[PDB]
């Protein structure tokens, strides 16, 4: 999944298999450093790309004047009544009109979707 | 100026 950069040359490590030991080794082409791979997964592609946008949402968006705010939905973490609510705001979000609520009030920074 | 099926 994640890309590892070699310490010796600070370049990308590409996967390589040692036939003798049948052990996966991440080895740079430029330098001879080789590292055993713990993850054992080379390439992962999510065609559905069903990735939650809750992680992507920034808590800073609560400060926006233009965002609608509801006091109807209380915050789960701290119970603050106000919460700005906005839709996906994302391209390639397929067809979702879910509201991604963000709790207002300083430093709570809680994002929940109902 | 009327609707979506009419005119603008």
């Amino acid at each position: 999944v994640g890309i590892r950069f070699c310490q010796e040359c600070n370049n990308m490590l590409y996967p390589k298999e040692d036939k003798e030991n049948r052990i996966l080794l991440y080895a740079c082409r430029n330098c001879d450093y080789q590292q055993e791979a713990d993850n054992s997964c080379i390439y992962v592609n999510k065609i559905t790309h069903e990735v939650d946008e809750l992680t992507q949402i920034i808590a800073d968006v609560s400060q926006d004047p233009t965002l609608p705010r509801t006091e109807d939905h209380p915050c789960q973490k701290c119970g603050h009544k106000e919460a700005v609510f906005f839709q996906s705001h994302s391209a390639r979000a397929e067809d979702a009109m879910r509201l991604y609520y963000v709790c207002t009030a300083p430093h709570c920074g809680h994002r929940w979707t109902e | 100026i009327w609707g979506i099926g009419c005119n603008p």
Binding site: T66, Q87, A96 | I1, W2, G3, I4
Partner: protein, 144 residues
């Protein structure tokens, strides 16, 4: 020639008296608009809860726009029909529409009841600003 010389005796005109309707008709038009706005709000709330089910061959955004446009168009047409009921025999807008000389039922409806939905490129007014049509509206407002 003959009809134009009779029209000197009878005469034709267009005035504000023709545009104005009965108070009952205005109240009916307003009630239709109120309930239409409430219906659009219910559709929006269904979409936000994800209760809306996509129409076959359409995305959820497309089917939401379809249902919202249907509600607004039905309200528009119903208000137009109420306005057209209000017209008297003497109404001159009706004289011209009935004779076919100029105008249409649509024009009478827009004059008296409701201008209707403004569509650009086949869709409702787009989000020219970031996620809002005009700076006065709140972001992500799909209301009427």
């Amino acid at each position: 020639t003959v009809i134009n010389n009779w029209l000197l005796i009878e005469g034709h005109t267009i005035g504000i008296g023709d545009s104005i309707a009965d108070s009952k008709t205005y109240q009916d038009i307003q009630n239709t608009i109120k309930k239409a706005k409430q219906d659009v709000i219910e559709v929006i709330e269904k979409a936000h809860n994800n209760e809306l089910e996509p129409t076959p061959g359409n995305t959820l955004r497309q089917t939401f726009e379809n249902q919202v446009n249907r509600i607004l168009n039905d309200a528009r047409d119903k208000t137009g029909s109420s306005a057209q009921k209000s017209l008297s025999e003497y109404n001159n807008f009706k004289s011209m529409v009935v004779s076919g000389a100029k105008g249409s039922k649509i024009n009478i409806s827009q004059v008296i009841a409701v201008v209707g939905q403004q569509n650009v490129e086949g869709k409702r007014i787009p989000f020219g600003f970031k996620h809002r049509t005009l700076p006065h509206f709140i972001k992500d407002d799909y209301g009427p």
